[PDB]
Protein: Peptostreptococcal albumin-binding protein
Organism: Finegoldia magna
Amino acid sequence: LKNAXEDAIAELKKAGITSDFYFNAXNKAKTVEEVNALXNEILKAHA
């Protein structure tokens, strides 16, 4: 967890988010708030 950026991509990629949705979640999320909310939303919805 050095930047909520590469770290989110890494965590979601290891989690397995359909195929590439996590990578699009990448250009959608800009601010850290979004990355954490729209991060948790993905992880929880695919828990």
The CA atoms of residues 25 and 42 lie 9 Å apart. The chain is about 65% helix and 0% strand. Residues 4-45 form one domain. The longest helix spans residues 5-15.
